[PDB]
């Protein structure tokens, strides 16, 4: 229902939606950072958020910075009970420095709906058709897909 | 309920499920790409999608390509209102070239359920037990976990 | 509602919550691994899980390892029908070796709520205000955001 935030400084910007049904609110750097090639920066938003009940806040990469500048977002799990400064962990996999300026949109926050399950240790799980299958078990192409189901 | 898609070319493949309760529909490259070591490619699916109400489309990495070939997916946030070509941002962190061929399953699309909250600026948030705690505050092992809760 | 797990060895640890409303259960390595710079390891938890109905298990990076050690999690999509050993695909983008020890919390499992939609091929999708817009279409700063909506 409501995403609450408070400013921790004059340098913060209220997050904004790129489009009417955008998955995420864009997050603004409060500061300048130089991210050297193959290095990381923790970008302060200088906001604290209170996420609505039944989600967490996922810090996700924008596609523009990813495709154009080889920028990625690490970490990314903002918990419903976190009241600290929301930090964006930026990864520069590019060959050139990446310059963040105060007021640049360098990530997006998604209200990812989750269950908060109680954990239950059991001795044996039920079986499934997938079973232990993983790590490319279903193959690479359309034939492999359809072979797998026979 | 329904994931709608339309083909933007003869080169596209309808996405397929790896298993009965797979989280994602596998996405097929429509083209050949050579991804050099420590470089990226934007892989066209040549599909446009209309995601159901209450989710976005997350482009996620397959575990086979990740574990075997050090392949990763950047960006990944397909918005409910996006009607463009779904692009997969592929990252090759491996030492060898990675070859994508038309018809290779090189990612998966998950209908991630999200809230579309209205954003509300407040002066002060409520407090929590976690508070400002983050960035490894709870430590590395089982003792650290249980110490934290005392 | 319930996250079921079974131990596949004496070396496993039941996953634990970092905080009362943590998004994820922390996952413990069952073994020692040396992750060389710019290399990957598949870390065995030696647990199998049965995820509740209506989610998948996303293996997500912790922020401490990300910010301090340039550690990232690849792959990450644990399907509801998977009954195998949950593996964490760890990426070391740092300059130094990263040492995993048995009993280290090196990732977190989130019960990400998803739709399992039936897929429907159509000839034409409806139009939207975003349309084909993506890959940085809305720009870099607050002016660009507000220009875009005019
Ligand atoms: O990080 C991960 C990712 C996947 N897995 C396992 C469980 C999951 O259900 C299974 C398949 O995951 P993906 O569908 O994401 N990868 P891929 O498509 O390559 O495997 P498959 O061909 O078997 O579906 O691999 C892990 O153990 N750790
Ligand atoms: O990208 C991020 C990730 C996390 N955080 C903050 C908020 C989050 O609630 C808190 C802890 O996140 P994680 O649980 O994902 N990382 P870690 O387990 O290392 O921290 P902790 O030991 O405090 O739980 O760190 C950020 O500010 N930016
Ligand atoms: O992996 C992706 C990510 C995004 N996209 C497309 C669809 C999505 O709706 C659109 C915008 O995604 P983001 O909002 O995550 N990136 P960015 O903010 O840079 O683009 P924009 O300024 O247009 O919102 O780009 C892809 O095709 N593949
Ligand atoms: Mg955007
Ligand atoms: Mg799969
Ligand atoms: Mg944590």
UniProtKB/TrEMBL annotation, chains A, B, C:
Disulfide bonds join 55-111. Keywords: Hydrolase, Magnesium, Metal-binding, Nucleotide metabolism. Residues 11-139 form the dUTPase-like domain. Its cofactor is Mg(2+). It comes from the Eukaryota. It catalyses: dUTP + H2O = dUMP + diphosphate + H(+). Involved in nucleotide metabolism via production of dUMP, the immediate precursor of thymidine nucleotides, and decreases the intracellular concentration of dUTP so that uracil cannot be incorporated into DNA. Catalyzes the cleavage of 2'-deoxyuridine 5'-triphosphate (dUTP) into 2'-deoxyuridine 5'-monophosphate (dUMP) and inorganic pyrophosphate and through its action efficiently prevents uracil misincorporation into DNA and at the same time provides dUMP, the substrate for de novo thymidylate biosynthesis. Inhibits peroxisome proliferator-activated receptor (PPAR) activity by binding of its N-terminal to PPAR, preventing the latter's dimerization with retinoid X receptor. Essential for embryonic development. Belongs to the dUTPase family. This is Deoxyuridine 5'-triphosphate nucleotidohydrolase. It comes from Sus scrofa (Pig). The chain holds residues 89 to 229 of 229 of the full protein.
């Amino acid at each position: 229902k409501r995403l609450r935030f408070a400013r921790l400084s004059e340098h913060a910007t209220a997050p904004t939606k790129g489009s009417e049904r955008a998955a995420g609110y864009d997050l603004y750097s409060a500061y300048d950072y130089t991210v050297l090639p193959m290095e990381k920066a923790i970008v302060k938003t200088d906001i604290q958020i209170a996420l609505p009940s039944g989600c967490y806040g996922r810090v996700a990469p924008r596609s523009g910075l990813a495709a154009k500048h080889f920028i990625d977002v690490g970490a990314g799990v903002i918990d419903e009970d976190y009241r600290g400064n929301v930090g964006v962990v930026l990864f520069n996999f590019g060959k050139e420095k990446f310059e963040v300026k105060k007021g640049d949109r360098i990530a997006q926050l998604i209200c990812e709906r989750i269950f908060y399950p109680e954990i239950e240790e059991v001795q044996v799980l039920d079986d499934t058709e997938r079973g232990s299958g993983g790590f490319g078990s279903t193959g690479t192409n359309l034939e492999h897909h359809h072979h797998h189901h026979h």
